[PDB]
Amino acid sequence: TGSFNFGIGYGTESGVSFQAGVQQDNWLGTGYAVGINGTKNDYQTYAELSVTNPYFTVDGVSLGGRLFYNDFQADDADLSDYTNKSYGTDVTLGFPINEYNSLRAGLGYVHNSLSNMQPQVAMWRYLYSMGEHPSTSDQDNSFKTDDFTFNYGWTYNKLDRGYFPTDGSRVNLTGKVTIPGSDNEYYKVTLDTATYVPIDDDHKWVVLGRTRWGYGDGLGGKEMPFYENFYAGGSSTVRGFQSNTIGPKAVYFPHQDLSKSDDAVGGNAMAVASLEFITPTPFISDKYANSVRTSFFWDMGTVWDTNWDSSQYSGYPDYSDPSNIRMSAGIALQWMSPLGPLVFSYAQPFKKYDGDKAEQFQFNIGKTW
C-alpha cells in the first residue's frame, strides 16, 4: 500500500546528510508508484516527485518519471564559487534485453539559474560562448537557461552479488544531448566499469578493476556548461585526494593580472582508473566477508579542459593537458554496520600536481540502506 523512510549519513566530502521519502505503492489502481523524496548535504539540496511503473507494458518495459528541484552551492563542494538553482522533469522508458543488459531512453527538461559566480577564466569562456558578458570584477550576476535533452543509457550488470561482489562485471554508459530549441547546445557521455576477478575458490581474495570516463563538448560554438563538468578526487574516484581537487584550477579575474589559484573547477574530459586487491580482514572471521571487506588499492585519474585557450594565457598552466595523471595508494575498509554501510580509507597521494589538495583519511556512512 505504501511506506516512508528517513536517513542520516556522513561523508568527508558531504558532511552530515539527511534523506526522507514517502511512497504510495499503487495509485488508485493504476499500477504507478507515486512518491516524494528529499536529500540534503553540505553543498546540495534535492527534492523530487517520483512516478514509476516496473510494468508499463506487461512485457516489463518500465516507465520512470521525475519533477525535481535542486540547489547546488559550489564552494561547499570545494569548487570555485557559484550557486545553481534548477528544476525540471524527466520521462524515461526502461527496456530489459536479457538478464544482464538493459537500455533506457528519455526526454528531459531542466531550468538552470546561475548566480554568485566568482569571475574566473574558464567559467567566463563558457559564458562568452553563450552570448553572456557579465562583469569580471563582480560576483553579483545571473544567467538563466531552459534546456530540453534526449537521454539514453546502457547498463550491463553480471555481478554475482549487489553488495560486496566477488565475480563479474558492471558497465554503465549514459548519454545526453540537447534538442534544438534549448539555450545550451552540448552532449555529455559517461562510462563506468567494474570487474571482479576471484583468484581463490572460496572467493575471499578478489581483484577489482574500476574505470570511469567522461567526455562532453559544446556544439556550434557553445561550450558545455561548467555545472555539467566532470570532477575527480575523493572517496569514490581517486582516494587520498580532496573531493574534486583533480584537474583544472580557477584562474580568477581581479575584483574592483589574473590570479592563479588552487580552487578546482572540474573539466569536460575525465578518466579515472583503480586497481584494488580485495582480501580477508585482519582480526575478523571470513564468515563476515559478506558484511566486512578489506582492500588495498592503486587509484589514478585526471580531469582536463579541452577548450583551455593556452594561446591567451601562456603564463598559466595549460589545463587542456590530459597527461597529468594523479595517483595514490592506500587501504580501504567497508562494513555493513548497525549505523549503515560504512567505508573508511587511508591513502597517500604519491603523484600530485601544482594546486592539488590531499585528504588522506576519508569516511562515509550511507543513509539509503
Binding site: 500500500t1 516512508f4 523512510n5 549519513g9 549505523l339
Partner: peptide
C-alpha cells in the same frame, strides 16, 4: 542509517 516504516 536508514529507518523504513511501511504504513
Amino acid at each position: 542509517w536508514n529507518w523504513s516504516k511501511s504504513f
